[PDB]
Structure formats: C-alpha cells, structure tokens
C-alpha cells in the first residue's frame, strides 16, 4: 500500500469528488461545511464537466488521500489564463509524502495544457505547513482581502 | 454632463469592453498590458457571453469612466457562489464621485440575481484609495498570496 495515483476528476467521478469534499471537511475541520450540505450529483457533474474548474485527487488505492480544487480565470486584458487554487488538503495520515506537491505538479500539467501562464493560491497567517509548501513552490506576496455582503444592494 | 450610467456588458458590447480595458491600462499604468495585446473580438464575446464572468462599466455618456471585472466561483462544497472582483478602476478625472461604489452596488445586484452569498477583492499594501474604499465597503483580512510557474511541470 501507499501507491498514490493522481488524476483530474471528470463528470463520471462524482463519487470521488464527494470523497474529496469529505477530505476537505475532515482536514479543514469543517465537516459540516464540506460534507453535510453537498450539492446534488448534477451540480457536481456540471462542475466537473466545466473547462474552468479543475478537481484533482490523489488515491491510495480506492480512498481519496489528497485533493485540490482550482478555477481557471480566462483573462480579459489579453488572451491568457491564470489558475487559482482554492482549496488543497492531504489526509493527516499521509502527510510529508509529496502528495500536495504532486497535485500541484499535476496542476502545472493542466495549466500547460490550457496555456495558463501562472497558478496562485492564498494562505492564512499561521498556516505554517501551507506557507512552507507554497514558499518552497512559489513566490510570496502579502496582500489584503475583503469580503462584501451583496445583501445591502441598493 | 456627469450623467453616469452603470451596466453589465453583454456580448454585443465588445466596443465598450475594449474601452474598459484601455481605462484599466491608463489607470493601472499598464497601457501595454491592457491596450496593446487585447484578445480578438471572439474571445471577448465569449467572455461576455459567459455566466461566470461579469464586466461592469460606468458611462459618462459615451465614454467609459469606470469598469469592474469579476469572476463567479460556483463552489464545490455546497451549491453556492462567490464573486471575485479582479480589477476595478475609475477615470482619474471622475474620482470621489461614487462610481466605484456604484459599480460594486451593481455587482451586488448581480450577485443577488445569481444567489452568490459573498463578493471579495484583494488590495495591495499602500494602495490607500482602494484600501479605504474596500474598508468602507467590506471586512478586511490580511493574507498571503503565492504565484507558481507551471513551466516547471515534471
Ligand atoms: C498543507 C498540506 C496540503 C501539506 O501536504 P503534504 O503532502 O504534506 O506536502 P508535501 O509533503 O507534498 O510537501 C511538503 C513541503 O511543504 C513544506 N511542508 C509540508 N508540511 C509541512 C509542515 N508540517 N511543516 C513545515 N513545512 C511543511 C516543506 O517544504 C515540505 O518540503 P520538504 O518536506 O522537502 O521540506 C496539508 O498538510 C494540509 O493541512 N492541508 C490543508 C492546508 C491548506 O492549505 N488549506 C487551505 C487551502 S490552500
Ligand atoms: C480606487 C478607485 C476605484 C476609487 O474609485 P472612486 O469612484 O473614486 O471611489 P468612490 O468615489 O465610489 O468611493 C470612494 C470611497 O472610498 C474611499 N476612497 C476613495 N478614494 C480615496 C482616496 N483617494 N483616499 C482615501 N479614501 C478614498 C473613501 O471611503 C470614499 O468614501 P467617502 O468619499 O464617502 O469617504 C480608483 O481611484 C482607482 O484608482 N482604481 C484602481 C485601483 C484598484 O483597486 N485597482 C486594482 C484592482 S482592485
Ligand atoms: C472568509 N473570507 C474568505 C477568505 O478567507 C478566502 O478564503 C481562502 C480560501 O481560498 C482557502 O480557504 C481554506 O483554507 C483555510 C485555511 N487557510 C480554511 C478554510 C478553507 N476554505 C485558503 N486557500 C485560504 C483562505 N483565506 O477567500 C474566500 C473568502 C470567503 O473571502
Ligand atoms: C503578480 N501576482 C498577481 C497578484 O498581484 C494578484 O493580483 C491582484 C489583482 O487581482 C488586481 O491587480 C490589479 O491591481 C493593481 C494594484 N493593486 C495592480 C495591477 C492590477 N492587475 C488587484 N485587485 C490586486 C492584485 N494583487 O493576483 C494575480 C497575480 C498574478 O497572482
């Protein structure tokens, strides 16, 4: 065991996508957010069918032990793409084994296939594993982010 | 004059989109990035046709004096959407007149129409106007961001 295989999920792999989401739940400690109100199978299908969403999964045999959810941003200034890693998680029982790194690597192959010139991801202050991983793999910038409630539309 | 009208651009408005991009160029001081290698009309059409890209523009009569480029992120954990402001600019000759605010407001109407529960935007340290605008309009978080070269795929 410990034969890890990485792939980009298609619309035929809703079962594996749901397992990625539970992984996300367990590992982000948001079991409710990620497992208890999942979309219907059509919704996931439509995600997985799309050219601008990428779901990557790592399998130790049958179980999903790593996943990565990204979005492709076709840019408007020029005919070029950027990729935005939204979420990335490896099973606690499978860390420091290169799975995250391999999913990013896989992601780079998808990017190359798409002609996307860059991939980016955001990390939180204190998320030290994530910060190390992306610092090893990327160029860091510190920035601000703001949420806005659309409720207040006038 | 100074009658400003805000709208979400459709695929019939490639001419106005190109003007948004020049605005972006002039105002971000990236005239090359934004004006000199624009996509072909089809590419823009396809952007403007899409349900997951939003281009908002403000017009003082015929000229574009404000624009906003966002992406809709249909989420995977749950059947819900988030909106990501990528770029936002108001003509230097038209600032502090509520145009940015009105484009965001417009954006909130689009979000509501989409069922999207939040909108977010990133700002740079020292971009004081932007920081004030989003601080007035949003809840700030400080975070890191990392670019990764897909070139190194192995
Ligand atoms: C971060 C996470 C994905 C790491 O996955 P991983 O497979 O263990 O990472 P890899 O083993 O492929 O590579 C780890 C590399 O990143 C860094 N790193 C990973 N875990 C680390 C840790 N615990 N402490 C310090 N650095 C760490 C190191 O550079 C390491 O390279 P090295 O072992 O040669 O020094 C996982 O532990 C996790 O908690 N996921 C959720 C975190 C997250 O970012 N969520 C929000 C979405 S981005
Ligand atoms: C930031 C920018 C969009 C402002 O547009 P604007 O129409 O002038 O903003 P509005 O007039 O609608 O509202 C401005 C509000 O934000 C803040 N603000 C705007 N300009 C400001 C400035 N120069 N200094 C301080 N605060 C400022 C204030 O809260 C103000 O509210 P108030 O006048 O009641 O105090 C524009 O000046 C610009 O430079 N665009 C590019 C910046 C950018 O963010 N680019 C990267 C993509 S996010
Ligand atoms: C509340 N505001 C939000 C803002 O936090 C941001 O969320 C980022 C998101 O991509 C990823 O979140 C995951 O990671 C972690 C640990 N870091 C916990 C929860 C996970 N989902 C991650 N790459 C970094 C996040 N900052 O954008 C969306 C938002 C709504 O604005
Ligand atoms: C180089 N790394 C990049 C990283 O900077 C980030 O760019 C953000 C982008 O949305 C918007 O940029 C605009 O604003 C400004 C002034 N702030 C200058 C150039 C404009 N295009 C803005 N909201 C904040 C940016 N930080 O993401 C993409 C990226 C490739 O990773």
Residue numbers in the entry:
A (entry chain A), B (entry chain A): 24 to 177
Lines from the paper:
The primary mode of resistance to aminoglycoside antibiotics is through chemical modification catalyzed by aminoglycoside-modifying enzymes. X-ray diffraction studies reveal that these enzymes bind aminoglycoside antibiotics in a conformation where the central 2-deoxystreptamine ring is in boat conformation. Similar to other AACs, AAC(3)-Ia and AAC(3)-XIa display the GNAT superfamily fold.
We have determined two crystal structures of AAC(3)-Ia from Acinetobacter baumannii and five of AAC(3)-XIa from C. striatum, in complex with various aminoglycosides and either CoASH or AcCoA, as well as a structure where one of two active sites contains AcCoA. Both AAC(3)-Ia structures only contain a single protomer per asymmetric unit. The experimental maps of the antibiotics in all AAC(3)-Ia and AAC(3)-XIa ternary complex structures presented in this report unambiguously place the aminoglycosides’ central ring in a boat conformation rather than the canonical chair conformation. Additionally, in all of these aminoglycosides the N-3, O-4 and O-5 atoms of the central ring were positioned in an axial plane rather than an equatorial plane, positioning the prime ring of aminoglycoside around 90° to the central ring. In the AAC(3)-Ia and AAC(3)-XIa complexes, regions of the adjacent protomer in the swapped dimer contribute to the aminoglycoside binding sites. In both structures, the C-terminal swapped dimer tail from the adjacent protomer makes direct contact with the aminoglycoside. A glutamic acid residue forms a hydrogen bond with N-3” in AAC(3)-Ia and N-3” in and N-1 in AAC(3)-XIa. In AAC(3)-Ia, the aminoglycoside site is opened and easy for ligands to access, whereas in AAC(3)-XIa, the aminoglycoside binding site is closed off and the enzyme would require a conformational shift to accept reactants and release products. Whereas AAC(3)-IIIa only made contacts with the central ring and the double prime ring, leaving the prime ring solvent exposed. In total, the boat-binder AAC(3)-Ia made 16 hydrogen bonds with sisomicin, and AAC(3)-XIa made 17 hydrogen bonds with acetylated sisomicin, while AAC(3)-IIIa only made 7 hydrogen bonds with sisomicin.
